[PDB]
Design a protein around this ligand. Structure first.
Ligand SMILES: [Mg+2]
Ligand SMILES: [Zn+2]
Ligand SMILES: [Zn+2]
Length: 395
DNA sequence: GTCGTTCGCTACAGGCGTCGGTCTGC
DNA sequence: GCAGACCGACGACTGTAGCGAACGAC
């Protein structure tokens, strides 16, 4: 079967995350969005595991079901050097064993969803490998809490340890990361990093796997690419929409080139804020090869359908109008990705003509994109002539 | 024209580095 | 004067009350 799975979210026990991020609400919104598989997130927190065991039914020792949505155990943890890592756990026993292993190195393993571990990246990855726990750098190019803001290579961070994937990130796609030859031997995950069950948050990115069943072991085979299983698609935000795509100030969000930031010594001259290097500049800084791996699954660039509806209707992202139109589209067609990429523009027009024209302009690269940077999300705008013209005249 | 309903924007919440400024024993 | 210890604030890890003000079915 072919399923869509988002393997990096955060519960309400994490920080700066909506209190609505509980198993029932997450499952409801994932089902509404057409999301087959969702990572649990924060699995090292015992209270979140208790809530899981409460609101779920067992599929196997590492797969659970809430309101028809499947869940495998995942967690993001922070390094001794302030570097985030994503981990996928085979069974609940691996979760509990890892949790007990790091209690002597952590002070918030029981009170937080994103724990801090007084362990280096190599130590964490080695402990995971010893327990067959899938480990990988999460949002690997963020200028604040990623691997590549701390290290110049995966080898410098993990040493003799092994990773099982690399989480791309909102502000990057597969080609950018594949500009580093090492990455060619590593599977990519495109996950949402959702702090909210909102439509444009939960499942903003995901991975499309081919599996026999929806279980942890099938997903592990799909990530490894063995036994006929495979990651056949990586759906993700257009890298320009991420918060850290370009190099900009952390306070006023004004964008600067890499040369300009170097000459300015990383302080914004118009607000005194700290300029943070974008992932595009960072990857070009670490650029290695012009080749790509052949086995690399295609990356489908997305823009959240709620954002399209908000820019068309000229209203806010949380408005009731965009919510109603988004629900109409989802009831009618079943998934955001289908409306964005797969559905014919004529069928989109039956629900809303302006949204159909905007989606056409998105598919045909005729949409204005103000790239994000320094912590500000990218903005999406549509030229006026697109909305003024008729559908049959676009092409 | 009324008055519930809805919108959009600002302020603010909360448990380990970085980054300026300050104090301290020479 | 000054190196170096000491210190406090600041923001990522972003979401949402909540408050004027505009809207929209009667
Ligand atoms: Mg992306
Ligand atoms: Zn993280
Ligand atoms: Zn600035």
């Amino acid at each position: 079967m072919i399923v869509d799975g988002d393997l990096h979210i955060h519960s309400h026990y994490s920080k700066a995350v909506s209190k609505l991020m509980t198993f029932p609400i997450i499952a409801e919104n994932a089902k509404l969005k057409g999301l087959n598989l969702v990572g649990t997130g924060d699995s090292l927190n015992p209270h979140w595991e208790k809530e899981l065991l409460k609101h779920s039914k067992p599929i196997d020792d590492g797969t659970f079901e809430v309101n028809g949505v499947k869940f495998i155990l995942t967690c993001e943890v922070e390094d001794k050097r302030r570097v985030h890592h994503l981990l996928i756990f085979p069974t609940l026993s691996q979760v509990r064993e890892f949790r007990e292993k790091v209690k002597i190195y952590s002070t918030n393993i029981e009170s937080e969803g994103r724990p801090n571990l007084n362990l280096t990246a190599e130590e964490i990855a080695e402990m995971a490998n010893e327990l067959d726990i899938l480990i990988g750098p999460a949002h690997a190019f963020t200028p604040w809490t990623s691997l590549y803001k701390e290290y110049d290579s995966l080898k410098d961070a993990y040493g003799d340890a092994k990773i099982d994937f690399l989480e791309l990130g909102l502000s990057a796609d597969s080609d950018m990361a594949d500009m580093i030859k090492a990455h060619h031997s590593i599977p990519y995950l495109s996950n949402s990093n959702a702090h909210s069950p909102n439509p444009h948050r939960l499942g903003r990115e995901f991975n499309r796997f081919e599996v026999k069943d929806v279980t942890f072991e099938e997903i592990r085979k799909a990530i490894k690419g063995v036994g006929g299983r495979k990651i056949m698609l990586n759906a993700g935000l257009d890298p320009r929409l991420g918060k850290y795509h370009l190099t900009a100030c952390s306070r006023c969000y004004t964008k600067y080139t890499l040369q300009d930031a170097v000459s300015l010594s990383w302080k914004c001259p118009k607000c005194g804020g700290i300029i943070k290097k974008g992932v595009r500049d960072r990857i070009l800084e670490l650029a290695d090869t012009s080749e790509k791996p052949k086995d690399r699954p295609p990356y489908v660039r997305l823009a959240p359908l709620a954002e399209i509806i908000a820019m068309v209707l000229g209203k806010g992202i949380e408005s009731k109008a965009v919510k109603l139109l988004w629900n109409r589209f989802l009831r009618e067609f079943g998934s955001e990705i289908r409306v964005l990429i797969d559905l014919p523009i004529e069928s989109i027009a039956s629900v809303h003509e302006g949204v159909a024209k905007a989606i056409w302009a998105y598919r045909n690269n005729k949409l204005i994109i103000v790239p994000g940077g320094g912590g500000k999300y990218g903005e999406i705008r549509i030229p006026e002539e697109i909305l003024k013209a008729k559908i049959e005249d676009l092409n």
